Design an enzyme around this catalytic site. Structure first.
Site, PDB file in Angstrom:
ATOM      1  N   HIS C 100      35.673 -18.678  53.233  1.00 33.60           N
ATOM      2  CA  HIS C 100      35.532 -17.680  54.645  1.00 33.60           C
ATOM      3  C   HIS C 100      34.468 -18.327  55.661  1.00 33.60           C
ATOM      4  O   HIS C 100      34.308 -18.132  56.742  1.00 33.60           O
ATOM      5  CB  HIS C 100      34.958 -16.377  54.339  1.00 33.60           C
ATOM      6  CG  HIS C 100      35.573 -15.192  55.267  1.00 33.60           C
ATOM      7  ND1 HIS C 100      35.598 -13.933  54.815  1.00 33.60           N
ATOM      8  CD2 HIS C 100      36.425 -15.490  56.444  1.00 33.60           C
ATOM      9  CE1 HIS C 100      36.269 -13.357  56.042  1.00 33.60           C
ATOM     10  NE2 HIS C 100      36.448 -14.142  56.849  1.00 33.60           N
ATOM     11  N   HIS C 140      30.108 -19.767  52.777  1.00 33.93           N
ATOM     12  CA  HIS C 140      31.103 -18.600  52.911  1.00 33.93           C
ATOM     13  C   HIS C 140      30.583 -17.330  53.097  1.00 33.93           C
ATOM     14  O   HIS C 140      31.110 -16.432  53.339  1.00 33.93           O
ATOM     15  CB  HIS C 140      32.379 -18.449  51.888  1.00 33.93           C
ATOM     16  CG  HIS C 140      31.905 -18.026  50.584  1.00 33.93           C
ATOM     17  ND1 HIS C 140      32.802 -17.708  49.602  1.00 33.93           N
ATOM     18  CD2 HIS C 140      30.754 -18.014  49.892  1.00 33.93           C
ATOM     19  CE1 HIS C 140      32.418 -17.397  48.516  1.00 33.93           C
ATOM     20  NE2 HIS C 140      30.983 -17.231  48.772  1.00 33.93           N
TER      21      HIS C 140
HETATM   22  C1  LIG Z   1      27.234 -14.125  43.649  1.00 36.24           C
HETATM   23  C2  LIG Z   1      26.522 -13.199  44.398  1.00 36.24           C
HETATM   24  N1  LIG Z   1      25.518 -12.200  43.711  1.00 36.24           N
HETATM   25  C3  LIG Z   1      27.498 -12.497  45.322  1.00 36.24           C
HETATM   26  O1  LIG Z   1      28.505 -11.483  44.689  1.00 36.24           O
HETATM   27  N2  LIG Z   1      27.436 -12.707  46.470  1.00 36.24           N
HETATM   28  C4  LIG Z   1      28.716 -13.191  47.268  1.00 36.24           C
HETATM   29  C5  LIG Z   1      28.396 -13.031  48.845  1.00 36.24           C
HETATM   30  C6  LIG Z   1      29.041 -13.967  49.777  1.00 36.24           C
HETATM   31  C7  LIG Z   1      30.614 -13.506  49.668  1.00 36.24           C
HETATM   32  C8  LIG Z   1      31.514 -14.280  50.779  1.00 36.24           C
HETATM   33  B1  LIG Z   1      32.941 -14.040  50.869  1.00 36.24           B
HETATM   34  O2  LIG Z   1      33.674 -14.820  51.848  1.00 36.24           O
HETATM   35  O3  LIG Z   1      33.514 -13.888  49.819  1.00 36.24           O
HETATM   36  O4  LIG Z   1      32.939 -12.625  51.639  1.00 36.24           O
HETATM   37  C9  LIG Z   1      26.869 -13.251  48.774  1.00 36.24           C
HETATM   38  N3  LIG Z   1      26.331 -12.300  49.777  1.00 36.24           N
HETATM   39  C10 LIG Z   1      26.456 -14.564  49.368  1.00 36.24           C
HETATM   40  O5  LIG Z   1      25.859 -14.726  50.430  1.00 36.24           O
HETATM   41  O6  LIG Z   1      26.741 -15.385  48.554  1.00 36.24           O
HETATM   42  C11 LIG Z   1      26.313 -12.691  47.218  1.00 36.24           C
HETATM   43 MN   LIG Z   2      34.179 -13.329  53.185  1.00 35.70          MN
END
Ligand SMILES: [C][C]([N])C(=O)N1[C][C]([C]/[C]=[C]/[B+]([O])([O])[O])[C@]([N])(C([O])=O)[C]1
Ligand SMILES: [Mn+2]
Ligand SMILES: [C][C]([N])C(=O)N1[C][C]([C]/[C]=[C]/[B+]([O])([O])[O])[C@]([N])(C([O])=O)[C]1
Ligand SMILES: [C][C]([N])C(=O)N1[C][C]([C]/[C]=[C]/[B+]([O])([O])[O])[C@]([N])(C([O])=O)[C]1
Ligand SMILES: [Mn+2]
Ligand SMILES: [Mn+2]
Ligand SMILES: [Mn+2]
Ligand SMILES: [Mn+2]
Ligand SMILES: [Mn+2]
Ligand code: NA
Ligand code: NA
Ligand code: NA
Lengths: 318, 318, 318
Positions: C100, C140
């Site tokens: 993302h 992401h």
């Molecule tokens: C591993 C962590 N505890 C988590 O689940 N997150 C995952 C989340 C980011 C998710 C990115 B997406 O593109 O899957 O929405 C997050 N806010 C970050 O900034 O890393 C934290």
């Molecule tokens: Mn995302």
């Protein structure tokens, strides 16, 4: 004793409206799940009229691409006769399918005794292809076209169906659960102005509003008998996997029981079809029992089994 | 520091309100999932009062068909004492079950300190059989009958329960999640006019309206302490399979968190029971962790964990 | 021919916004599922602009704890260029992710041609961490911080991102699906007053009201182009398991199609991202096809595939 709990069970072990063998065992597996005993347990007067004997019609070449026309027509002819008999005896007809082509018979027979009936059709599909718009040639995808007065001049003389008189108008049917509608069927739906709640509608409005709208639409003007034609593939395949034409994103088990609870409470259920259970198509034994248990649950709701509970007219604290 | 985040944890490793061994491990498995640490992580002042020692009562023949009456009565007596202690210390009581018979103790103890409490009861079942209407004889299906003032003269003198004084009126309880209600229980429900949202209601109205109606009903007149008695079988067995009396078509995981999020936000949660987790009844290890994780998630929502997110009163952009 | 069915497909096989290899295969697996052919089947003018060649940037040490900054910045720079090209050609940009972080590029490129765009962001996560609030360091989880004008002075000069000009205001984005929001992100959300429908909201209001509110909010004032950035983890892991950051209690398959059906019907979809499909993270082959089929279904709804059915402007009864 109660009119909405007075029942005539007809088994319709028929499969030639579609290609997959196994749907003809629907009545057997539903019966073996205790359907009749469970109906009796909730204060229903239950008569079992048995399984109709559908004679093999070995010479039944297709009409254009429409398959098994004479078998399908004859099976529905016989069923219409039997449903009318049950209706004349003052009972709610319970048809155990069997493939959905049989609705031609069930609704026709019902309409002989109660020509004012309204139909609620629960299904992933509209089942409204004509013999000319169908691309599959399977007659379980065509029963509604045969019943609808507005389509009279668009149904060719198909062998096996000369006994059919269309008995419902476009205004007399409501669809719930739609999610796999062929282009020609969608054209028919929009042209005739038929009332439908596709999964989009259900998502939009919630099943509560859907049922309120369905019943006001069918019963607002005046009370009249309801025919519920229930294709188990209207429910999501996570609840009813053992069926021939599953489509993901269906009605939930809860949604299935809500629909049928609400219909039961009108007091006007007059005809019921429980269709398209095909035990041979479960990936495992548990998929079969899951499917059959769901079908039985849906049926019991139709005759008054309520999630809030039920009690007899006595003082249980004495 | 926050009154809705000030917590007293009581383990109630007790199973004799029902037949299946294993529910007595609920507190252990919930603790081993990090319940206490996770509560602390979200700014809660957490005191662990330990697991109550429930003495074996070897001589406990049934009272008519009611099983283990003296054990069940005594375990609830002890629990009532402990909940009252926790409440006197200014904490929200968190009872880790254990079978639901223990609600007799939990609510009784709570009511000693806050006699104005209102109860929200989340469950597939009403748990309102009396010793005389029950057909199972299992006391986890009877706690509400013991608590309700209106049923005083209909509860026989059951050994183990002479300490009980009914402490809530029919108007002081709301059920959410009902879908397996015995005929006598339904009679009691309708006779006493108890407010309930069976799965039919939830389907009809949506969980949003259900919670709005539940809280207006209990709190409209005046604010007062809430006791949430949460039977994990209120959630569908696809989320909480490891439990003794699963019933299909339950509340979703989302619905579970909505309920508890909304209760948390009232600021009035005063007592909580997390009941009927039976790790021995998972078909697989994953069914156990699925059940336990769901229970922990429900509990954390009760003390302020929100799906939209949470932050401390600081400037995170500094 | 139809503006809402005129499409430019861009593959973005990129993974360095997060740790798990495999997301770079998203475009391949989506294509292999027949995405392009299926789009054409529903009367879409489809141009495939191919998969962008993202040069390895071997020297890319972290910026503080932010990982692969130069790779992530450059991949988004290239994508922005390509999306702008597609938009100049009069087509709806369809970006196949990929992780993302690429939304930085997609939205930036889109905004070059249509600076008035509004964004609908479907996701379990807010993806609004800054380089300074992130605890994971994975980019992401940060694209929205880079795009938002209100956060200009809070984004440090991260190597790879000097080309970025924030192009949307807090009022120009709506989140749907939130259920795992970091404390700093929640602080940002509440501080900037961004419109969101967390799972709590969806539970409260139903997806119907959510979409009505989302579209009135974004389009009430005046019509303008919509950019839908769809993270498959916004849907529950029971539908899209093959993804890097699954979170239980998500949007259903039905809810996914409702969202996209409603967006399609505005006529204003201008940009679409289908992100975070990681086939390597399916526990089984069926988990991969389940994920990919769901993604394809979501995409087809965006370009007019409707659950009620579709037909061409002809008389099917002739
Ligand atoms: C591993 C962590 N505890 C988590 O689940 N997150 C995952 C989340 C980011 C998710 C990115 B997406 O593109 O899957 O929405 C997050 N806010 C970050 O900034 O890393 C934290
Ligand atoms: Mn995302
Ligand atoms: C195989 C075919 N692509 C299909 O899924 N359809 C199945 C559907 C008929 C379904 C019948 B039913 O009783 O299951 O509702 C259909 N409209 C037809 O006419 O054959 C087309
Ligand atoms: C086995 C029995 N048919 C049942 O499912 N019931 C279970 C139910 C009690 C459930 C207790 B609970 O704590 O799980 O809610 C019941 N009403 C009773 O009184 O035993 C009857
Ligand atoms: Mn059908
Ligand atoms: Mn069907
Ligand atoms: Mn209980
Ligand atoms: Mn229960
Ligand atoms: Mn995400
Ligand atoms: Na079917
Ligand atoms: Na239970
Ligand atoms: Na993701």
């Amino acid at each position: 004793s109660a009119k909405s709990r007075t029942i005539g069970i007809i088994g319709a072990p028929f499969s030639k409206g579609q290609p997959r063998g196994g749907v003809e065992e629907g009545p057997t597996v539903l019966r073996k799940a205790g359907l009749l005993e469970k109906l009796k347990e909730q204060e229903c007067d239950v008569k079992d009229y048995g399984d109709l004997p559908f004679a093999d019609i070995p010479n039944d070449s297709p009409f254009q691409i429409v398959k098994n026309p004479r078998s399908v027509g004859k099976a529905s002819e016989q069923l219409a006769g039997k449903v009318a008999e049950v209706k004349k005896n003052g009972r709610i007809s319970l048809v155990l399918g069997g493939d959905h082509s049989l609705a031609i018979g069930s609704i026709s027979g019902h309409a002989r005794v109660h020509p004012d009936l309204g139909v609620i059709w629960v299904d992933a599909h509209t089942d409204i292809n004509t013999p000319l718009t169908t691309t599959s040639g399977n007659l379980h995808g065509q029963p509604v076209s045969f019943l609808l007065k507005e389509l009279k001049g668009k149904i060719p003389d198909v062998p096996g169906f000369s006994w059919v008189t269309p008995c419902i108008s476009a205004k007399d049917i409501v669809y719930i659960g739609l999610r796999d509608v062929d282009p020609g069927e969608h054209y028919i739906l929009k042209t005739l102005g038929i009332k439908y709640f596709s999964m989009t509608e259900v998502d939009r409005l919630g099943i509560g509003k859907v049922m309120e709208e369905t019943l006001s639409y069918l019963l607002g003007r005046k009370k009249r008998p309801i025919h519920l034609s229930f294709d188990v593939d209207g429910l999501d395949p996570s609840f009813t996997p053992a069926t021939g034409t599953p489509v993901v994103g269906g009605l939930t088990y809860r949604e299935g029981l809500y629909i049928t609870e609400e219909i039961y409470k009108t007091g006007l259920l007059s005809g019921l079809d429980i269709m398209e259970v095909n035990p041979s198509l479960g990936k495992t034994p548990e998929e079969v029992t899951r499917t059959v248990n769901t079908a039985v649950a849906i049926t019991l709701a139709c005759f008054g089994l309520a999630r809030e509970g039920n009690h007899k007219p006595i003082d249980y604290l004495n």
